[PDB]
Design a protein around this ligand. Structure first.
Ligand SMILES: Nc1ncnc2c1ncn2[C@@H]1O[C@H](COP(=O)(O)OP(=O)(O)OP(=O)(O)O)[C@@H](O)[C@H]1O
Ligand SMILES: Nc1ncnc2c1ncn2[C@@H]1O[C@H](COP(=O)(O)OP(=O)(O)OP(=O)(O)O)[C@@H](O)[C@H]1O
Ligand SMILES: Nc1ncnc2c1ncn2[C@@H]1O[C@H](COP(=O)(O)OP(=O)(O)OP(=O)(O)O)[C@@H](O)[C@H]1O
Ligand SMILES: [Mg+2]
Ligand SMILES: [Mg+2]
Ligand SMILES: [Mg+2]
Lengths: 401, 88, 398, 51
């Protein structure tokens, strides 16, 4: 029995009511939106910054002189030298050319396998170039020590000692191992529950690594083009070999080191196979201690987990009571806490909680102390934080006693 | 292979049948030849070393490379995969 | 530095009801808008050196200018730049380019003919990422949420208070929670609390769906996540909102599929950016999921998501607050006793305590009434509550 | 007849002009240069016509 609306009904509904100010307000809103759009269009620039130096820095009219005189040179590698000598040059992907040197360079300068520049017209070799240093692989280095030391890692004395015996002791004091004929393990696989502190130990090692520390970004190794990830792994391991006693950290190794299956991952599997032979196989790896971490060790290919590539498998178990107390002290060193805080009770109230949950509890206690305007967080704040962080995420406890 | 890695067969343990098989199928036909042609028994063209990971396949390959005057030409599966079509 | 690119928003008008005070407020805002328009329109027109330098630079640069990647820096006036097609060119670095920014991996701007480097592209942000940035802040403020007080307090302490009053955290010695997860039944107020935070917040707000982070190509996913977090870091104070996290945050499991293993890789890149080697910086992540039991434990562990805010189905007081919020505009009648519908059994959510309002309005329109009545609300409830089939046991328990 | 002939001649003249590229636009830069992404090639910072 419902009846549809007509034109007169619509008109009366939109008129029979409030019309003394509704029309004016609606028009004002529409025109305010229009004015905002007009202003945005009028400015609508946000001039994007470009690398233009200060006016005095360049102030050069000879830049045109160098542009007109100097000529761009394609970079290519001389695969072979022919004997007037002729040179076979691979212009990356363009084509293969058989060119001869320009008078500027001497024949002795150009050697087989060296990447040299060539003119865009005749392809003559004009100048040698330093061997390629990959930009992503080079940026994969640390060159900035994180500010987390071994004193910030608590409850893992045995694990930390094993990690040092793997990545630090063999580098600092090779004599203790050479005298007894002991080859120190070259790799460590830090596997444990998430938030237990593997990455913290890795950061501590990088902090006191006193060598080349390379953090392997799982994103770069997985590349869009086929064969690019294996090339990146091969470049990273070469850059590690050129240095002395390098340290490679394969964070979240389960990102690429999945179990092979029969297209599936395929390309990532090829990159994994490239890392496997680099770590172990022909052509000994050298002084490159590999550090791998993963919260899910069961998905790794058995080849990558075999004790020839990851020699020492450190298990980062949930901290025991002493470990939890030490973690609480470490994370509460800066907190303005009262002097009677029984950290033992807070440790015993977090039965199975990693270091990350302990830090969360400490931050929650601080936030509770901030809620009520108190600058000192009493033990009651810590108890409430423990309830909120662990217990939050009676009849069941009734049976127990 | 130009560094000629050193690994005597004594370093390989638990695989006496497999080491002999590889030597007779990859080495004996190599430096003898005319003898095999005498008996008219075709030597296998290749050896596929398959087994559980870490069994020592690459170790036997290294031992063969070290204790063989042949020109070992190592390579990896990932190495023969390149973006440019036909590069592999 | 590149400080926050906070979203722009006009001031709020309090009257709401079409009273002349609201008209005056809107007229004042329009007056200031016309003020700005006239000022900036006269500036260039009323306007009548560096022109020589600009002309010289642009004549040396020429057009069009190719955007390429800098591979290496050989000398102070030479570098190897690889054009977009993958071909490397040994081009000459011109004087008018700050050598400080020229670093490997940067997007260099090159002359089209000689390929000589002429400038360094600063932003070069992935277009699929620059879209995420919130420019027009949503109009839904905190007053537009009924209840969810505890939740509002937690979200404020996580993403809002730290910027405004960092003194408390600095003195207490605790780093403010830098990650919050909003989980609960559907239609509870998760995306709302996100919209309100984006409206009130002064930091750059980035919105993602949890499905746009996945790209068809293999390495595009992790690289997109890295680009998003790099853009967030570029604007120091930032809030990144990854709604529908359960799209890519599913529990990691041995998958015989590159699709699944690619999604797992995207999740791994996300959790590496959130809390891994290198600090995350001053970027706060807010995530919403109507399913938190299916998320990878690593993603929702303390350190990445530090406050697992729960969003329950509204209770009686909260339901009354959502009826007051969504009926304030409506011209209610005298006999509308909302408590009758507010009672409910246990399962009335905001969406419903709003669709119910919309349905009551429509039923009032059916009878040609712009003022709703109790019968309209009861009919609207009966019509719009038909969501769950049984969801209940039989008459077993006593 | 003259109008028809002129139309055909103009069509022939315009046909000889080179076809223009088509590429997406990333963002305006300085109110006179626009960053664009041609299909097969890479990015380009191009100027804008008067109209
Ligand atoms: N054992 C610990 N002692 C002290 N702090 C810890 C410990 N474990 C974790 N933390 C704290 O938690 C932060 C994050 O933990 P971390 O990233 O090391 O966990 P993880 O186990 O490496 O994580 P995942 O397995 O998910 O990669 C650390 O920076 C530190 O502040
Ligand atoms: N039968 C064996 N005799 C001697 N050494 C062995 C034996 N089996 C394994 N090993 C040693 O343990 C490791 C076995 O791996 P190896 O380097 O031989 O490659 P692999 O067995 O082919 O491994 P993968 O399957 O990962 O390629 C080597 O360090 C090797 O010296
Ligand atoms: N507590 C509330 N107070 C006020 N309005 C609410 C409330 N809950 C829901 N609403 C209204 O209903 C809409 C739906 O709520 P919201 O968008 O927050 O859903 P959600 O929790 O994100 O659910 P989903 O899982 O479907 O994304 C809100 O945009 C708002 O208009
Ligand atoms: Mg980690
Ligand atoms: Mg092998
Ligand atoms: Mg939502």
């Amino acid at each position: 029995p419902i009846r549809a609306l007509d034109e007169g009904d619509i008109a009366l509904l939109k008129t029979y009511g409030q019309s003394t100010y509704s029309r004016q307000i609606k028009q004002v809103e529409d025109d305010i939106q229009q004015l905002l759009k007009k202003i945005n269009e009028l400015t609508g620039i946000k001039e994007s910054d470009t690398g233009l130096a200060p006016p005095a820095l360049w102030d050069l009219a000879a830049d045109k002189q160098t542009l007109q005189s100097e000529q761009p040179l394609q970079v290519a590698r001389c695969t072979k030298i022919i004997n007037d000598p002729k040179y076979i040059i691979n212009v990356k992907q363009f084509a293969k050319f058989v060119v001869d040197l320009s008078d500027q360079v001497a024949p002795t300068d150009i050697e087989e396998g060296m990447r040299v520049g060539v003119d865009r017209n005749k392809y003559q070799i004009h100048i040698p170039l330093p061997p390629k240093i990959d930009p992503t692989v080079t940026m994969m280095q640390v060159e900035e020590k994180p500010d987390v030391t071994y004193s910030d890692v608590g409850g893992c004395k045995e694990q930390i000692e094993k990690l040092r015996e793997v990545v630090e002791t063999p580098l600092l004091h090779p004599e203790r191992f050479v005298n007894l004929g002991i080859e120190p393990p070259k790799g460590v696989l830090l596997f444990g529950p998430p938030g237990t502190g593997k990455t913290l130990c890795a950061r501590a090692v990088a902090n006191r690594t006193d060598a080349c520390f390379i953090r392997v970004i799982g994103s770069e190794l997985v590349q869009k083009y086929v064969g690019e990830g294996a090339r990146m792994v091969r470049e990273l391991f070469e850059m590690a070999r050129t240095k002395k006693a390098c340290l490679i950290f394969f964070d979240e190794i389960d990102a690429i080191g999945g179990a092979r299956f029969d297209g599936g991952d395929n390309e990532v599997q090829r990159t994994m196979l490239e890392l496997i032979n680099q770590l172990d196989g022909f052509d000994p790896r050298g002084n490159i201690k590999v550090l791998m971490a993963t919260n899910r060790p069961d998905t790794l290919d058995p080849a990558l987990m075999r004790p020839g590539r990851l020699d020492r498998k450190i298990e980062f178990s949930l901290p025991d009571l002493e470990g939890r107390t030490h973690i609480f002290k470490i994370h509460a060193r800066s907190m303005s806490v009262e002097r009677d805080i029984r950290f033992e009770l807070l440790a015993r109230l977090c039965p199975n909680s990693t270091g990350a949950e302990i830090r969360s509890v400490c931050t929650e206690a601080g936030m509770f102390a901030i809620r009520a305007r108190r600058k000192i967080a009493t033990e009651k704040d810590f108890l409430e934080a423990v309830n909120k962080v662990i217990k939050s995420y009676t009849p069941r406890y009734m049976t127990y006693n | 292979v130009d560094e000629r890695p050193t690994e005597q067969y004594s370093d390989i343990g638990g695989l006496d049948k497999q080491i002999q098989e590889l030597v007779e199928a990859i080495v004996l036909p190599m430096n003898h030849k005319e003898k095999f042609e005498n008996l008219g028994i075709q030597p296998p063209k290749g050896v596929l070393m398959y087994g559980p990971p870490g069994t020592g396949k690459t170790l036997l390959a290294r031992a063969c490379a070290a204790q063989t005057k042949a020109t070992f030409l190592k390579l990896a599966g990932p190495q023969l995969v390149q973006m440019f079509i036909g590069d592999g | 530095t590149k400080g926050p690119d906070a979203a722009s928003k006009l001031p709020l008008v309090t009257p709401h009801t079409q009273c002349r005070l609201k008209l005056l407020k809107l007229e004042r805002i329009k007056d200031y808008l016309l003020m700005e328009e006239e000022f900036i329109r006269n500036q260039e027109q009323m306007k009548p050196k560096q022109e020589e330098e600009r002309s010289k630079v642009d004549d040396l640069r020429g057009t069009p200018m190719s955007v390429g990647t800098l591979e290496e820096i050989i000398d102070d006036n030479h570098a190897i730049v690889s054009t977009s097609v993958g071909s490397e060119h040994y081009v000459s670095i011109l004087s008018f380019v700050d050598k400080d920014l020229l670093e490997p991996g940067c997007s260099v701007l090159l002359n089209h003919k000689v390929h000589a480097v002429i400038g360094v592209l600063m932003d070069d942000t992935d277009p699929l990422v620059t879209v995420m940035k919130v420019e027009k802040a949503p109009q839904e403020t905190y007053a537009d949420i009924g209840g969810l007080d505890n939740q509002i307090q937690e979200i404020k302490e996580s993403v809002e208070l730290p910027l405004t009053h960092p003194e408390y955290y600095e003195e207490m010695g605790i780093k403010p929670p830098k990650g919050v997860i909003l989980y609960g039944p559907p239609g509870t107020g998760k995306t709302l609390l996100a919209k309100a935070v984006a409206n009130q917040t002064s930091a750059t707000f980035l919105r993602v769906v949890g499905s746009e982070l996945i790209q068809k190509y293999l390495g595009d996913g992790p690289k997109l996540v890295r680009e998003l977090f790099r853009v967030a870091e570029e604007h120091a104070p930032s809030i990144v909102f990854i709604d529908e996290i359960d799209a890519i945050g599913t529990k990691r499991y041995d998958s015989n599929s590159g699709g699944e293993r690619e999604i797992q890789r995207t999740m791994l890149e996300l959790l590496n950016q959130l809390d891994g080697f290198d600090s995350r910086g001053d970027v706060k992540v807010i995530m919403a999921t109507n399913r938190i039991e299916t998320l990878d434990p690593a993603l929702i562990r303390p350190g990445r998501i530090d406050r697992k805010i729960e969003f329950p189905l509204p209770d009686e007081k909260t339901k009354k607050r959502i009826f007051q919020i969504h009926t304030s505009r409506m011209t209610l009648a005298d006999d509308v006793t909302l408590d009758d519908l507010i009672m409910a059994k246990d399962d009335l959510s905001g969406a419903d305590i709003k669709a119910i309002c919309t349905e009551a309005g429509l039923m009032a329109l059916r009878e040609r009434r712009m003022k709703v009545t109790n019968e309209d609300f009861k009919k609207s409830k009966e019509n719009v509550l038909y969501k769950k089939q049984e969801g209940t046991p039989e008459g077993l328990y006593l | 007849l003259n109008a028809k002939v002129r139309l055909l001649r103009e069509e022939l003249q315009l046909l000889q002009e080179q076809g223009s590229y088509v590429g997406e636009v990333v963002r305006a830069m300085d109110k006179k240069k626009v960053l664009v992404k041609v299909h097969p090639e890479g990015k380009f910072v191009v100027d804008v016509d008067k109209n």
